[PDB]
Amino acid sequence: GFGTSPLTPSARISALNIVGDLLRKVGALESKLAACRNFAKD
């Protein structure tokens, strides 16, 4: 309750690893749903 400390480098690298997984998944979901919307408009 004294404040927030810096994130360790290893924890920062772990969070970066996970955000990579999230960005690959969201990119694929974006492409899938964009294709659904664009196939329908066409």
Partner: protein
């Protein structure tokens, strides 16, 4: 499709892991079930629109973690 749902389930687990890394929350009182249910009811728009917002937010988090600011 079930494959879309399984990818989103994996993203939800990724976000729980990121929460555990980043939090200083010392039964995880900072996570409120009633707030999660309300948000699942009230988030506006179709899946494509929500995905675009999720992607923008993830790109922002990535920039904070990679660049440090």
């Amino acid at each position: 499709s079930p494959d879309l749902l399984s990818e989103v389930s994996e993203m939800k687990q990724d976000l729980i892991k990121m929460t555990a890394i980043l939090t200083t929350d010392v039964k995880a009182g900072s996570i409120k079930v009633k707030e999660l249910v309300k948000a699942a009811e009230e988030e506006p728009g179709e899946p494509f629109e929500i995905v675009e917002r999720v992607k923008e937010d993830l790109e922002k988090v990535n920039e904070i973690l990679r660049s440090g600011t």
